[PDB]
Structure 1
Amino acid sequence: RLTPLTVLLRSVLDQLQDKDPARIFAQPVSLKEVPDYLDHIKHPMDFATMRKRLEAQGYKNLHEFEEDFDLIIDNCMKYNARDTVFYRAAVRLRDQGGVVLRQARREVDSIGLEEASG
């Protein structure tokens, strides 16, 4: 059943998806369209995959969730050249999503997980 952590992470994940209006990070990179993607990228990640893990209650804490978000960003910045729509979108999401994640971390530290999740 339902931990304050899952309640918090549901909110945080939707706030992160709210920073991706193009849906660039919403679903896995297609290996059919980009057949060399995994040559380069060991741990693919995207928001749908994070949601599945979240709903399976597979995150121990906020840090583990943040690490998956960081994979999304870091994979994109590794795979794509700097002068691309993908790289620019990853930088913007790193910036805007970072604000969201830092706020969540500080709220948990300030008022506790139970209160922060509510």
Structure 2
Amino acid sequence: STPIQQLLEHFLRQLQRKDPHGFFAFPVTDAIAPGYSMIIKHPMDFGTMKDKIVANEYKSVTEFKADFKLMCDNAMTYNRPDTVYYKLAKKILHAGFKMMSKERLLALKRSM
């Protein structure tokens, strides 16, 4: 269980806590979101991100953040602004990028 794996697990646990209803837990289906797959070309979700951590597919924080951004951007593309999914995507995006900022990562660097 590599250091990066342990770190991303931690970030992921913190992010999933801001989604109590599990809207980002698993892939959005066409059954619950009509036409979704005709609009979103690269679906992403916490579940898929988890699997990639376990399989050791992320080489950096950068690559993990990219998948996280893809997830929020997908929500803000398919959904209209005045929806719960759009608003939660924005909120979580901002809190994710604050948690995983260059400046916080640097402070951590300096104390190791």
Tell me the TM-score normalized by structure 1.
0.84
Distance 1:107 1:92 in 2: 19
Tell me the TM-score normalized by structure 2.
0.88
Question: 81, 88, 105: which is aligned to 1:108?
Answer: 105
RMSD: 2.0
Distance 2:73 2:97 in 1: 13
- Residue deviations 1:33-83, cap 9 Å, x none? 224112111110010110001110010100000000001100000010111
For residue 107 of structure 1, report the CA deviation from its aligned partner: 4.1
Letter in 2 for 1:110: A
**Is the counterpart of residue 69 in structure 1 residue 47 in structure 2?**
no
**Is the counterpart of residue 46 in structure 1 residue 33 in structure 2?**
no
Which residues of structure 1 form unaligned runs of 5+? none
**SS at structure 2 position matched to 1:81:** coil
**SS at structure 2 position matched to 1:27:** coil
Letter in 2 for 1:101: M
Larger relative contact order (C-alpha < 8 A, sep ≥ 6)? 1
Distance 1:49 1:30 in 2: 14
Which residues of structure 2 form unaligned runs of 5+? none
Q: Provide the identity percentage.
A: 41
Distance 2:46 2:72 in 1: 11
**Paired residue for 1:94?**
93
Count of residue pairs the alignment pairs up: 112
